[PDB]
């Protein structure tokens, strides 16, 4: 009964909302589960956005310590209040009569080319949202690093309340943040915590994906990723050169050991380039070297 996650009962949701346990503890929600359809919708919307930022809402429910996201929709944003809330209310009213019973559980927005984290404005927005409508979660997607690394870059964060000082306990995996966004990442890094993200899909979705792979391998075998992202690598090289200049300036005198961070960024970019090249080498071996 894998499909049991799709069954929605309103009585249990009302009981949980009226018996809110998240008002006592603060590190309560630590698991986020996203449907396959919702994740694909976010990825396609972010990619269609281009090099700009796109934001939408996230419908779903709660289950114990788990935030479940089922669907999504894109806000116009050409706007905080007014237009955004009008669109949210109208879309929810329209979708409630066709079978979509769940209400909002979060908001998502894209961070194209500078990682998955919450800025100062995002932290303030999340604080405002969690003050009034709870529970809530903020999903940040990097649509450009997804193509470059061949991995879905997504992060679901939840913001600590004002005046609360958690005692350390931060793993904080390394993120290659550009130079002009390093200061913003430093001041607001301990005001939120990340939720571990998992994905789920139904049985018909699984069967359809298995049947789709029988003909979707052609696109994998003819990707040629070295050309789809040629400006991203140039921007990365520019940022890396600036970081190298700053590390050299630090060396001439006398972050901590900025040379190590610049080296890590250079290694990441170079490894992505070599992966893109070896894919084409494999294609050349398979298809062009059958010279009869």
């Amino acid at each position: 009964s894998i499909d049991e996650i799709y069954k929605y009962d309103k009585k249990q949701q009302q009981e949980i909302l009226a018996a809110k346990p998240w008002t006592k503890d603060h590190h309560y929600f630590k698991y986020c589960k996203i449907s396959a359809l919702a994740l694909l919708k976010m990825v396609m919307h972010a990619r269609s956005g281009g090099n700009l930022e796109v934001m939408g809402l996230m419908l779903g429910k709660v289950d114990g310590e788990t935030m479940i996201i089922m669907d999504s929709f894109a806000l116009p944003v050409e706007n905080a209040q007014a237009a955004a809330y009008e669109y949210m209310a109208a879309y929810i009213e329209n979708a409630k009569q066709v079978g979509r019973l769940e209400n909002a559980i979060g908001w998502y927005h894209s961070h194209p080319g500078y990682g998955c984290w919450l800025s100062g404005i995002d932290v303030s927005t999340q604080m405002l949202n969690q003050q009034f409508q709870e529970p809530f979660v903020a999903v940040v997607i990097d649509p450009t690093r997804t193509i470059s690394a061949g991995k879905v870059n997504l992060g679901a964060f939840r913001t600590y309340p004002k005046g609360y000082k958690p005692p350390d306990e931060g793993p904080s995996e390394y993120q290659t943040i550009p130079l002009n966004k390093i200061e913003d990442f430093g001041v607001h890094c301990k005001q939120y915590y990340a939720l571990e993200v998992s994905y789920f899909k139904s049985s018909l979705d699984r069967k359809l994906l298995e049947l789709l792979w029988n003909k979707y391998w052609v696109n994998t075998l003819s990707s040629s990723s070295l050309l789809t992202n040629a400006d991203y690598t140039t921007g990365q090289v520019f940022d890396l050169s600036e970081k190298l200049e700053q590390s050299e300036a630090q060396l001439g005198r006398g972050s901590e050991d900025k040379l190590a961070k610049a080296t890590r960024d250079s290694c990441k970019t170079t490894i992505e380039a070599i992966h893109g090249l070896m894919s084409q080498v494999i294609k050349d071996k398979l298809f062009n070297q059958i010279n009869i």
Binding site: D231, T234, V237, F238, L240, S241, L244, E245, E248, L251
Partner: protein, 213 residues
């Protein structure tokens, strides 16, 4: 009501010799509405000067659609001005030249028309040439001379002025007398980034090595 109109017209001419075409056009319009309630023979000259200003600054764009402009434009007393405006809007050098040639004793006689007819002709020629060179990659200069109806030397002078003023993006091949338009460009930002990376690496390794002793 003649002294203030005359002084306004004189101030308009002085501004016309000194640029700042917006305020000159406003002064010309003020003189025009002053002459509307004054002597008829000055009205045609004021209309001529107003049209001269309009085609000189090429941004006012005031055709005969004005409700007060129609009763004077439709008057057969002055008609070459409407043809000149039509030629300017249509950007036809041939029609402009035929209007200038046919309409003698009414355009040549006025000196203020003559002191700016060269500028108007140069403006329309430049616009026509800019439109002409749009699709081509390498284009002969005698071809441009045939189209614009000027000799090859004047075409080369016009092209030199346009290229210097960063208006035409191309270069003149003088030995074989053609013009090559710079339409072939590629992604040269990657090599600039690589050069910057190389320079930073050079300085950084110099400093790191110099750190020891």
């Amino acid at each position: 009501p003649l002294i203030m109109g005359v002084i306004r017209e004189c101030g308009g001419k002085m501004h016309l010799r000194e640029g700042e075409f917006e305020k000159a056009h406003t002064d010309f319009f003020e003189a025009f509405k002053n002459y509307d309630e004054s002597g008829s023979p000055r009205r045609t000259t004021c209309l001529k000067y107003l049209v001269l200003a309009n085609m000189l600054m090429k941004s006012g764009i005031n055709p005969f659609d004005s409700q007060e402009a129609k009763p004077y434009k439709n008057d057969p007393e002055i008609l070459a001005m409407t043809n000149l405006v039509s030629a300017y809007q249509n950007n036809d050098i041939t029609e402009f030249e035929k209007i200038l040639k046919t309409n003698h004793s009414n355009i040549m006689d006025d000196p203020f028309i003559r002191e700016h007819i060269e500028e108007l002709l140069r403006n329309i020629r430049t616009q026509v040439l800019i439109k002409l060179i749009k699709p081509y990659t390498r284009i002969h200069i005698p071809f441009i001379s045939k189209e614009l109806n000027i000799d090859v030397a004047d075409v080369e002078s016009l092209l030199v002025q346009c290229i210097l003023d960063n208006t035409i993006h191309g270069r003149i091949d003088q030995v074989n007398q053609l013009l090559e338009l710079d339409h072939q460009k590629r992604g040269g930002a990657r090599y600039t980034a690589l050069d910057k990376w190389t320079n930073q690496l050079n300085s950084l390794n110099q400093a790191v090595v110099s750190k020891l002793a």
